[PDB]
Amino acid sequence: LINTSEVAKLKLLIMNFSFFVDSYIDLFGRTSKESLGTPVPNNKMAEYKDEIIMILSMALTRSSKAEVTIRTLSVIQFTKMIKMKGFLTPEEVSLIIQYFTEEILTDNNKNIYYACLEGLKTISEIYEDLVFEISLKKLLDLLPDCFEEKIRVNDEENIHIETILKIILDFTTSRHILVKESITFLATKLNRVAKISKSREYCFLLISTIYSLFNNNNQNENVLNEEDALALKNAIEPKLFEIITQESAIVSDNYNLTLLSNVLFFTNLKIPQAAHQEELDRYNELFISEGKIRILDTPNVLAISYAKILSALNKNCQFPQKFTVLFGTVQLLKKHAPRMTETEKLGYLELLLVLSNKFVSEKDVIGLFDWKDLSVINLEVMVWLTKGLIMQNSLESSEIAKKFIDLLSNEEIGSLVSKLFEVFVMDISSLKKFKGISWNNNVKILYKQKFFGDIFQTLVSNYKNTVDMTIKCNYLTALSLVLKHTPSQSVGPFINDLFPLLLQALDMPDPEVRVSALETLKDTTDKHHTLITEHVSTIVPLLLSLSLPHKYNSVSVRLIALQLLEMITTVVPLNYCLSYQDDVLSALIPVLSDKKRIIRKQCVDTRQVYYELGQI
Amino acid sequence: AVVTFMANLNIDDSKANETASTVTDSIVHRSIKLLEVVVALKDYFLSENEVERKKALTCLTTILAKTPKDHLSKNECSVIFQFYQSKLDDQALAKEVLEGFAALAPMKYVSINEIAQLLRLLLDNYQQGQHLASTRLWPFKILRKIFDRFFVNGSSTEQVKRINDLFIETFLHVANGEKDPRNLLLSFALNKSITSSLQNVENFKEDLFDVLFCYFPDLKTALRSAITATPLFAEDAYSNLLDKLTASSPVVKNDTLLTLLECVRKFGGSSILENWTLLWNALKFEIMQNYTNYDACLKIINLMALQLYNFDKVSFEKFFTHVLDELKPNFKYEKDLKQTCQILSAIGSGNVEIFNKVISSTFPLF
């Protein structure tokens, strides 16, 4: 233990100290958040504490930037020495935090970069106020008033404007004070860069960072507690409407508005129920009954947020105006549809779904039915309501499903119903039995499978009982858009009758149905073999056309065609596979030479495996 | 009564019940010496050596179970203070504490402070069911008895409404560590009762089947009666049961057909009226697939048709017309007469009216 900056001497000193810290730990203890300053009675390391502190400080800082192992071991031993119960003063950990931050902003060397990240994160989990005061506040201060500037750490070395955002995303993931003050300051800077500056990507990144920090805490339910999330909401929400008022980038860009909706959903998801109601009432008064914004009278983009508001506000609390808002948004969708923008219409549809699954009972939906008008808006309303009904698992939804099948036999309206029929089966990301919340909705996970069992059979019978372009295309599109969201391996009995439409669904523009049907043939050929053996002479050139470059064959689509070609060649015996070697070897040349290279690598592998299977 | 002191000191001699009988005789003699012997035992197991502590604790638990006469609520809570400290310190003495818990849970001498301190700390320090065969065997007992004492909805939860939700995840805490079949049966029965007798399980449902599925592979009919106990497994039952129509091994297929039998029986008529079409599709697929599974699925079809008929004649009529529309060429022709004829044979064996329906629908065909 002698002062030295040489790589060998200092490295051996540090790796020796790595064992003396362990001996000291085993003899005495380790940190607790209550023992952050309490030292152990006596030892000889206290007499050497100044020397080890100095050698570590000169090993990390006042050292050349080319030291990867030296600085990594330096920050590691800094962190390990911090890990002792109150043996280093808050001044020492403050100096260590400053060293970590300076050496992480100066050097891009991802060794020292990520090692300093690890040290700062461990300090954050063992020292809330210390890291929040030295590192976090400084990092929040580096960013300037205007977007797209060079974050000048010092005279020469500078980091990007997004580097501060990335560092904020790194830690504060479990530090209550850090994360709350970070959310507040990021909201402040969002407001500032929208008001005194004119930026879009910075506002988007800031609101996305707010969303991510809210998510990292709602995953723990304790980093922001119920009351902590309520207080941070009361801090950020007026700061969010004041940036709503100015054009900003959250109103100018509807994507940042959706990020704000996610932030509101997360911060109202962690709200005490006794404080939900009034807030709900406020929302129930602000959006429906009164207020400047009226979702029931004039379409507006911010309405989408209210959807995430209603799924996040309490259900089993007095929400008297739930049927009237459903009727009002139905009327607005019927009337204002040409002047409704995409964000407005999507938000009102999500609001329809939220009421259907959460607040309004099934009687309101069934009383809202009107099948006499075969209009696009009417179909949208009925589909998005009976989607929550299916999510509620009732007769109507299942019987309305058959009604939809029948109406899908129509020429010009059955086609629209078939192309829109995906809506019934999708994920929600806002209304499921999420961890934490239990009053979210009338959630039923069995909706997908049930809907498939109610749809598939009739669809296939109709397809085999149909002649023309339109109605058969409708049946194929409907069954495909239903099977795409339901897991293919969870629907087994339907596979056998699905195989004809399964083979049919391999040629159509949407790569979504393409990936879905390719997955379904994968599962089928894994399970079924008689169908595969009897239908290989038909499937193989279809997979070949899938593997060909096309206006509809994405690079991923061609990759999946390669995967299915491999799977069907493995399952089908060698007799038919020998007859289908040269075609795959020849019609793949734009796939092992396309724009992406995973496509190229996997096409090379597909060609090689086909060649070795044919030659043997 | 010198018998008091001789028993209190000879329990260390590993006399087991021989000195316990003398303790009971002493309690009969002086009628006040039970508290004296338990408090003289309080520091008697305080010694660190294993024999002293374990033999004092086993007799303490035994005579505490044998002393429900004079036993106060706050004194009760104080009694489990040493139970918890022994749980915290070491094992191989915590087992006696486990029989003590499984003995004190049934009795009504469980205070509000006791039920709360239990539901918090019996898994705070002890983390029941995590270690050792018996030290994981008895926690299921103690939680079963604390459920069946007053937390079970025999008197509802007018003063134990706090433990409802948290009992869900404290039973989930004691899981994934018990492998002997007895603990498996215990977990199955606990899920069965904690869904059906207990209220407000819907707020925290579908997670109680996690321990069962982890313990699910024999003597497994307890899980099967659990998944059919209450309509709360409705959303759960189909969630697995339809998948079990696709199962390969016929034993689980038959057992799950029995479970669907009790399900259709005790899920009212609304759920069966909801799922009649998908269930008939799946069961006809299994008819083509197959106490075997075939008689079980015929009984499934029979009970499902009967449930629709008794619940709503409209639903049973929709079922009957769908079955006729799908199978009428089979009956009229000479193709697939066995399966379809057996299907309507089971259907018509429900009542006289359904039998007349089946006869008038099939006899004119052939």
Per-residue 3-state assignment (H helix, E strand, C coil) for A440-462: CCCCCCCHHHHHHHHHHHHHHHH
Q: Which two tokens stand for residue A554?
A: 């994405």
Provide the residue count of chain A.
616
Return d(Cα B257, Cα B298) in angstroms, integer.
Answer: 10
Q: Which residue of A has its CA nearest to B274?
A: A395
Q: Which two tokens stand for residue A597?
A: 């290279």
Return d(Cα B40, Cα B38) in angstroms, integer.
Answer: 5
Return d(Cα A599, Cα A546) in angstroms, integer.
Answer: 13
Which residue in A545, A493, A497 sits closest to A518, CA to CA? Answer: A545
**CB neighbour burial string for A273-303, b if at least 16 within 10 angstroms, e if fewer:** eebbbebbbebbebbbeeeeebbbeebbbbb
Which residue in B43, B1, B39, B42 sits closest to B23, CA to CA? Answer: B1
Contacting residues for A529 by C-beta, under 8 A, at least 6 apart = A571
Which residue in A475, A456, A396, A390 sits closest to A424, CA to CA? Answer: A390
CB hemisphere CA count around B194 (13 angstroms): 32
Return d(Cα A31, Cα A29) in angstroms, integer.
Answer: 7
By Cβ distance, the residue of B204, B273, B278 closest to A450 is: B278
Return d(Cα A98, Cα A76) in angstroms, integer.
Answer: 15
Q: Which two tokens stand for residue A346?
A: 């999507």
Return d(Cα A111, Cα A76) in angstroms, integer.
Answer: 12
Residue type, A375: S
Per DSSP, the residues of A572-613 read: S-HHHHHTTSHHHHHTTTTTTTSSSSHHHHHHHHHHHHHHHH
Rounded to a whole number, what is the distance in Å from the CA of A43 to chain B's nearest CA?
A: 29
The secondary structure element, H or E, covering residue A396 is helix A395-407
Q: Which two tokens stand for residue A501?
A: 């439409």
CA distances from B268 to B189, B230, B262, B273 (A): 22, 10, 11, 9
Contacting residues for A26 by C-beta, under 8 A, at least 6 apart = none
Residue type, A61: T
The secondary structure element, H or E, covering residue A158 is strand A158-159
Contact B203 A493 (CB under 8 A): no
Q: How far is C-alpha A461 from the geometric centre of its chain's CA atoms?
A: 38
Q: Which two tokens stand for residue B343?
A: 């299907």
Question: In sequence order, what E strands does A42-139 have?
Answer: none
- Helix A447-463 crosses helix A495-504 at what angle (to 10 degrees)? 70
Q: Which two tokens stand for residue B103?
A: 């003995």
* Long-range contacts of the stretch A412-417 (C-beta < 8 A, 24+): A412/A470, A413/A374, A413/A379, A414/A470, A414/A471, A414/A474, A415/A470, A415/A473, A415/A474, A415/A477, A416/A376, A416/A379, A417/A379, A417/A474, A417/A478
CB B215 within 8 Å of CB B187 = yes
Q: At residue B157, what are phi and psi to the nearest 5 degrees?
A: -135, 50
Exposure of B198 by Cβ count < 10 A (0-12 exposed, 13-18 middle, 19+ buried)?
Answer: buried
Contact A457 B285 (CB under 8 A): no
Return d(Cα A418, Cα A479) in angstroms, integer.
Answer: 8
Interface of A with B in 430-459 (CB under 8 A): 433, 438-439, 444-446, 449-450, 453-454, 457
CB A359 within 8 Å of CB B201 = no
Q: Which residue of A has its CA nearest to B318?
A: A399
Return d(Cα A335, Cα A324) in angstroms, integer.
Answer: 16
Three-state secondary structure call for residue A178: helix
Q: Which two tokens stand for residue B5?
A: 């002191």
DSSP state of A40: P
Q: Which two tokens stand for residue A175?
A: 């530090």
CB of A395 within 8 Å of any CB in chain B?
yes
- With helix as H, strand as E and coil as C, how does chain B read? CHHHHHHHHHHHHCCCHHHHHHHHHHHHHHCCHHHHHHHHHHCCCCCCCHHHHHHHHHHHHHHHHCCCCCCCHHHHHHHHHHHHHHHHHCCCCHHHHHHHHHHHCCCCCCCHHHHHHHHHHCCCCCCCCCCCHHHHHHHHHHHHHHHHHHHCCCECECCCCCHHHHHHHHHHHCCCCCCCHHHHHHHHHHHHHHHHCCCCCHHHCCCHHHHHHHHCCCCCHHHHHHCCCCCHHHHHHHHHHHHHHCCCCHHHHHHHHHHHHHHHHHCCCHHHHHHHHHHHHHHHHHHHHCCCCHHHHHHHHHHHHHHHHHHCHHHHHHHHHHHHHHHHHHHHCCCCHHHHHHHHHHHHCCCHHHHHHHHHHHCCCC
Provide the residue count of chain B.
366
User: Token match 């700062």: residue?
Assistant: A120
Q: Which residue of B has its CA nearest to A443?
A: B235
End-to-end Cα spacing for chain B: 93
Return d(Cα A529, Cα A601) in angstroms, integer.
Answer: 29
Q: Which two tokens stand for residue A249?
A: 């980038």
Q: Which two tokens stand for residue A550?
A: 């096309």
DSSP state of A39: P
Contacting residues for A524 by C-beta, under 8 A, at least 6 apart = A495, A498, A499, A502, A531, A532
Residue type, B170: T
CB B248 within 8 Å of CB B213 = no
Q: At residue B155, what are phi and psi to the nearest 5 degrees?
A: -120, 25
The secondary structure element, H or E, covering residue A58 is helix A49-60
Q: How far is C-alpha A390 from the geometric centre of its chain's CA atoms?
A: 24
Q: Which residues of B touch A401 (CB under 8 A)?
A: none
User: Token match 């060609």: residue?
Assistant: A607
SS3 content of chain A, % helix, strand, coil (to 5): 65, 0, 30
Contact A450 B206 (CB under 8 A): no
DSSP state of A85: T
Return d(Cα A21, Cα A84) in angstroms, integer.
Answer: 8
User: Token match 């379409």: residue?
Assistant: A299
Contact A453 B246 (CB under 8 A): no
CA distances from A371 to A368, A407, A408 (A): 10, 10, 13
Three-state secondary structure call for residue A484: coil
CA distances from B16 to A219, B6, B11, B57 (A): 52, 13, 7, 11
Which residue in A402, A339, A106, A513 sits closest to B277, CA to CA? Answer: A402
Return d(Cα A102, Cα A69) in angstroms, integer.
Answer: 18
Q: Which two tokens stand for residue A151?
A: 């974050």
Contact A453 B282 (CB under 8 A): yes
Q: Which residues of B touch A492 (CB under 8 A)?
A: 246
Question: In sequence order, what E strands does A309-450 have?
Answer: none
Q: Which two tokens stand for residue B278?
A: 């998908």
Q: At residue A151, what are phi and psi to the nearest 5 degrees?
A: -75, 95
Neighbour tally for A153: CB within 10 Å: 17
Return d(Cα A552, Cα A184) in angstroms, integer.
Answer: 46
Return d(Cα A146, Cα B107) in angstroms, integer.
Answer: 71
CB B276 within 8 Å of CB B304 = yes
Return d(Cα A91, Cα A97) in angstroms, integer.
Answer: 10
Q: How far is C-alpha B197 from the geometric centre of its chain's CA atoms?
A: 11
Which among A386, A398, A459 is the top mutation candidate for probing chain B, defined by the most B β-carbons within 10 Å of its own β-carbon?
A: A398
Which residue in A529, A512, A522, A531 sits closest to A566, CA to CA? Answer: A522
CB B252 within 8 Å of CB B245 = no
Q: Which residue of A has its CA nearest to B284?
A: A493
Return d(Cα B173, Cα B189) in angstroms, integer.
Answer: 16
Q: CA A355, A361, A364 angle in degrees (round to 5)?
A: 85
Q: Which residue of B has its CA nearest to A397?
A: B274
DSSP state of A421: G
By Cβ distance, the residue of A394, A438, A444 closest to B203 is: A438
Q: Are strands A158-159 and A151-152 parallel, antiparallel or unpaired?
A: antiparallel
Q: At residue A494, what are phi and psi to the nearest 5 degrees?
A: -80, -10
Return d(Cα A182, Cα A213) in angstroms, integer.
Answer: 9
Q: Which residue of A has its CA nearest to B241?
A: A446
Rounded to a whole number, what is the distance in Å from the CA of A395 to chain B's nearest CA?
A: 5
Exposure of B51 by Cβ count < 10 A (0-12 exposed, 13-18 middle, 19+ buried)?
Answer: exposed
The secondary structure element, H or E, covering residue A562 is helix A555-571
Q: Which two tokens stand for residue A591?
A: 């796939």
Phi-psi region of B156 (alpha: psi -120 to 50; beta: other; left: phi over 0): left
**CB neighbour burial string for A79-117, b if at least 16 within 10 angstroms, e if fewer:** bbbbbbbbbbeeebbbbbbebbbbbbbbbebeebbebbb
Residue type, A507: D
Deposited experimental method: cryo-EM
Three-state secondary structure call for residue A163: helix
CB hemisphere CA count around A484 (13 angstroms): 21
Which residue in A317, A344, A347 sits closest to A430, CA to CA? Answer: A347
Resolution reading in Å = 12.8
Contact B274 A394 (CB under 8 A): yes
Contact A490 B278 (CB under 8 A): no
Breaks (C-N over 2.5 A) in chain A follow: none
Contacting residues for B129 by C-beta, under 8 A, at least 6 apart = B135, B136, B139, B140, B173, B174, B175, B177, B178, B183
Rounded to a whole number, what is the distance in Å from the CA of B281 to chain A's nearest CA?
A: 8
Which residue in B90, B29, B99, B13 sits closest to B60, CA to CA? Answer: B99
- Residue A159 β-bridge partners: A151
* Long-range contacts of the stretch A242-248 (C-beta < 8 A, 24+): A242/A191, A243/A190, A243/A191, A243/A194, A243/A195, A244/A302, A246/A194, A246/A195, A247/A194, A248/A190, A248/A194, A248/A195, A248/A203
Radius of gyration of chain A (CA): 31
Contact B277 A444 (CB under 8 A): no
CA distances from B346 to A478, B274, B299, B300 (A): 35, 21, 7, 9
By Cβ distance, the residue of A439, A453, A490 closest to B278 is: A453
Contacting residues for A292 by C-beta, under 8 A, at least 6 apart = none
- Residue A152 β-bridge partners: A158
CB A287 within 8 Å of CB A293 = yes
Breaks (C-N over 2.5 A) in chain B follow: 217, 290
CB hemisphere CA count around A305 (13 angstroms): 25
Q: Which two tokens stand for residue B162?
A: 């706090």
DSSP state of A64: -
Neighbour tally for B44: CB within 10 Å: 21
Q: Which residues of A touch B274 (CB under 8 A)?
A: 393-395, 398
Which residue in B213, B198, B215 sits closest to B157, CA to CA? Answer: B198
Q: How far is C-alpha A369 from the geometric centre of its chain's CA atoms?
A: 34
Return d(Cα A456, Cα A448) in angstroms, integer.
Answer: 12
Which residue in A315, A309, A314, A275 sits closest to A293, CA to CA? Answer: A309
